[PDB]
Amino acid sequence: PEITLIIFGVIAGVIGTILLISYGIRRL
């Protein structure tokens, strides 16, 4: 049931982390 939430979390986590790094290197 939380399968939806888990898959969401992984994809969002991966994308979020990448976008945060990208933002970080632009501004540093």
UniProtKB/Swiss-Prot annotation:
The chain crosses the membrane at residues 3-25. Changing G9L: Diminishes dimerization. Changing P1C: Diminishes dimerization. It comes from the Eukaryota. Changing E2C: Diminishes dimerization. Changing L5I: Diminishes dimerization. It is found in: Cell membrane. Changing I6A: Diminishes dimerization. The major O-linked glycan are NeuAc-alpha-(2-3)-Gal-beta-(1-3)-[NeuAc-alpha-(2-6)]-GalNAcOH (about 78 %) and NeuAc-alpha-(2-3)-Gal-beta-(1-3)-GalNAcOH (17 %). Minor O-glycans (5 %) include NeuAc-alpha-(2-3)-Gal-beta-(1-3)-[NeuAc-alpha-(2-6)]-GalNAcOH NeuAc-alpha-(2-8)-NeuAc-alpha-(2-3)-Gal-beta-(1-3)-GalNAcOH. About 1% of all O-linked glycans carry blood group A, B and H determinants. Belongs to the glycophorin A family. Component of the ankyrin-1 complex, a multiprotein complex involved in the stability and shape of the erythrocyte membrane. Glycophorin A is the major intrinsic membrane protein of the erythrocyte. The N-terminal glycosylated segment, which lies outside the erythrocyte membrane, has MN blood group receptors. Appears to be important for the function of SLC4A1 and is required for high activity of SLC4A1. May be involved in translocation of SLC4A1 to the plasma membrane. Involved in several unequal homologous recombinations or gene conversion events, predominantly with GYPB and more rarely with GYPE. The resulting fusion proteins are observed in different phenotypes and encode low incidence bloodgroup antigens. Homodimer. Component of the ankyrin-1 complex in the erythrocyte, composed of ANK1, RHCE, RHAG, SLC4A1, EPB42, GYPA, GYPB and AQP1. Interacts with SLC4A1; a GYPA monomer is bound at each end of the SLC4A1 dimer forming a heterotetramer. (Microbial infection) Interacts with Streptococcus gordonii hsa protein. This is Glycophorin-A. The gene is GYPA.
